Structure 1
């Protein structure tokens, strides 16, 4: 046995293209649309729950994941690749930051760590790149609210608003017209729902849409009282009901 694939499976072609990264981006293009919008007092990330069968319970499949109490992530592309990245992202948030500094990492640095993991799958021996693009939304004390995209290559960029996957080109145009620097969080959620309706064919409700916010601190979700400086998580996943309430004012 032994892993005898100690050489790169991603290499430069004569034209300067890294084929395996380009093909991973193609796999991302085929994936279901997800988006992110940044407001003045929050961030929203959203996607369609494209259920593979109606017998499946799509609540059990989580496309929008908590990474830290103040950071969340959504994807487009290959689901399994996303799941293992979420596991590695949560662990690296502790091992390379919380266990050292006694606090959760800021958004940009966690993103950077996830980006590093994806870059190494682009250069290390005997592996293919991750077939996903991530959108990571988060808050921290000194940088405030932020939104980042991460691609298969490991490259990451900050956004005011963006989309990835299937109908990203049309969605990004829709967001350019609507976005401004004076949006409140509710206005951003409203725009996210409008934008996401264009790329959804079938049913459009709280059971077929997954949507989460990075907003105010939620002391009700903390699980314990008695420490004034611990005020709870800023990440919150909206319920099926909460989505349907905003679809009547649509």
Structure 2
């Protein structure tokens, strides 16, 4: 066994395109529409609960997730990929900030940490 894929699966093509990032963006394009609007005294994020079956209980599937008491996240694309990113985002908010400074991270820095996880999946083996 052992993970013997220690090399990049995302690589530059002769035209300078990173194929796997482009294709990932294509998957996002197919995904259900989600939006965000910033007001003077708040922000709103919204999406459609595209229920796969009417027998399914769509309340048990959360597309809009709390990351910190003052930060929320919504997505478009692959739901499972979103769910694990929310788990990583919630944890990194604690490990790389709250357990150091005794307060929740500002929006931009938590976004920065989520961004770093998504960049690494673009270059890591």
Aligned length: 122
Give the drift of 1:36: 0.1
What are the ranges of 5 or more consecutive residues in structure 1 without an aligned counterpart? 123-250
**Matches of 2:119 and 2:57 in 1, distance apart?**
34
> Secondary structure of the equivalent of 2:54?
coil
Deviation at 1:59, TM superposition (A): 0.1
Report the 3-state secondary structure (helix = DSSP H, G, I; strand = E; otherwise coil) of the residue aligned with 2:74. Answer: strand
TM-score computed with the length of structure 2 as normaliser? 0.98
Structure 1 position 81, deviation (Å): 0.1
Q: CA deviation at 1:16?
A: 0.2
Match of 1:197 in 2: none
3-state DSSP of counterpart to 1:77: coil
- CA–CA distance in structure 2, aligned partners of residues 102 and 71 of structure 1: 16
Task: Tell me how far apart the structure 1 counterparts of residues 57 and 12 of structure 2 sit (CA, whole Å).
Answer: 42
- Would you tell me which structure has more strand in proportion to its own residues? 1
Alignment correspondent of 2:97: 97
Cα deviation 1:189-247 (Å, max 9, x = unaligned): xxxxxxxxxxxxxxxxxxxxxxxxxxxxxxxxxxxxxxxxxxxxxxxxxxxxxxxxxxx
Q: CA RMSD in A?
A: 0.1
Quote how far apart the aligned CAs of 1:37 are: 0.1
Q: How far apart are the structure 2 equivalents of 1:65 and 1:3?
A: 32
Residues 127-182 of structure 1 deviation map (CA, whole Å, 9 limit, x = unaligned): xxxxxxxxxxxxxxxxxxxxxxxxxxxxxxxxxxxxxxxxxxxxxxxxxxxxxxxx
Q: Which residue of 2 aligns with 1:85?
A: 85
Q: Post-superposition shift, 1:82?
A: 0.1
Q: What displacement does 1:90 show?
A: 0.2
C-alpha distance in 1 between matches for 2:64 and 2:2: 36
| Partner Cα distance (2:55, 2:92) in 1 | 35
Which structure 2 segments of 5+ residues have no match? Answer: none
Q: TM-score w.r.t. structure 1 length?
A: 0.49
Alpha-carbon deviation of 1:13? Answer: 0.2
What CA distance in whole angstroms lies between the structure 1 residues aligned with 2:43 and 2:49? 20
Q: How much does 1:38 deviate?
A: 0.2
Q: Per the alignment, in what secondary structure is the counterpart of residue 61 of structure 2? A: coil
* Residue 77 of structure 1: how far off its partner (Å): 0.1
**For residue 30 of structure 1, what is the aligned residue in structure 2?**
30
Task: Kindly report structure 1 stretches of 4+ aligned residues shifted beyond 6 Å.
Answer: none
Deviation at 1:119, TM superposition (A): 0.1
